[PDB]
């Protein structure tokens, strides 16, 4: 799973409804990757991946590679759902990056809600920012998939989830992107980051 003992990702989807899913994670082993590889895809300012990874802790950091589905106005949303056994309040920071420069930072809060003997954190139908909406509209008009991938080699997302009250990092996911054919549909591969 994408998860620690303290906080587990349960579901993540980005979508349009007039429901089409661009990406979708629903929730053994897990493979690994050297963070060293992907430092250049994120800022080296504060909120840089190298910095975050230093006294991390290490086991909190994951990489997701998405093969997205661009084959569909509208409502553009992002729904995520986490869970834990501790009652917490979460700060969720999403940083969109283009050529290793941060161009968007979205910061949200969610308090634990009791359900079926555990705590769930529901950040549902958060409206996708306008930068991504326009970017997606442009991207889908490209005539070849290899062009879309070329454009996407420069585009990344860094998602940091901290315990609001203690300021401890619970989860840090790096996201990288290509597109899929409609035939194959959306896919992802969750790795762990090591050093
Ligand atoms: C090919 C890219 C597909 C787009 C998928 C969006 C990925 C997650 C969005 C990042 C977090 C929220 C951003 C926002 O609400 O502005």
Swiss-Prot record:
It comes from the Eukaryota. Its main location: nucleus. Keywords: Activator, DNA-binding, Nucleus, Transcription, Transcription regulation. Residues 1-195 are annotated as: Transcriptional activation. One of its GO terms (molecular function) is DNA-binding transcription factor activity. The keyword GTP-binding does not apply. One of its GO terms (cellular component) is intracellular membrane-bounded organelle. It is found in: Nucleus. GO terms for biological process: cellular response to retinoic acid; embryonic heart tube morphogenesis; embryonic organ development; hippo signaling; lateral mesoderm development; neural tube closure; notochord development; paraxial mesoderm development. Transcription factor which plays a key role in the Hippo signaling pathway, a pathway involved in organ size control and tumor suppression by restricting proliferation and promoting apoptosis. The core of this pathway is composed of a kinase cascade wherein MST1/MST2, in complex with its regulatory protein SAV1, phosphorylates and activates LATS1/2 in complex with its regulatory protein MOB1, which in turn phosphorylates and inactivates YAP1 oncoprotein and WWTR1/TAZ. Interacts with YAP1 and WWTR1/TAZ. This is Transcriptional enhancer factor TEF-4. The gene is TEAD2.
């Amino acid at each position: 799973g994408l998860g620690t003992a303290r906080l587990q990702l349960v579901e993540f989807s980005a979508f349009v409804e007039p429901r089409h899913l661009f990406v979708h994670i629903s929730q053994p082993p897990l493979e690994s990757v050297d963070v060293r590889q992907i430092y250049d895809k994120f800022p080296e300012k504060k909120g840089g991946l190298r910095e975050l990874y230093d006294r991390g802790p290490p086991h909190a950091f994951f990489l997701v590679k998405f093969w997205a589905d661009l084959n569909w106005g509208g409502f553009y949303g992002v729904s995520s759902q986490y869970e834990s056994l501790e009652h917490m309040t979460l700060t969720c920071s999403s940083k969109v990056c283009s050529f290793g420069k941060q161009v968007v930072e979205k910061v949200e809060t969610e308090r634990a809600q009791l359900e079926d003997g555990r705590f769930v954190y529901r950040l549902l139908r958060s409206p996708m920012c306008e930068y991504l909406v326009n970017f997606l509209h442009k991207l889908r008009q490209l005539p070849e998939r290899y062009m879309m991938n070329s454009v996407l080699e420069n585009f990344t997302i860094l998602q940091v989830v901290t315990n609001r009250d203690t300021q401890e990092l619970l989860l840090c996911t790096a996201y990288v992107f290509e597109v899929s054919t409609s035939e194959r549909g959306a896919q992802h591969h969750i790795y762990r980051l090591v050093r």
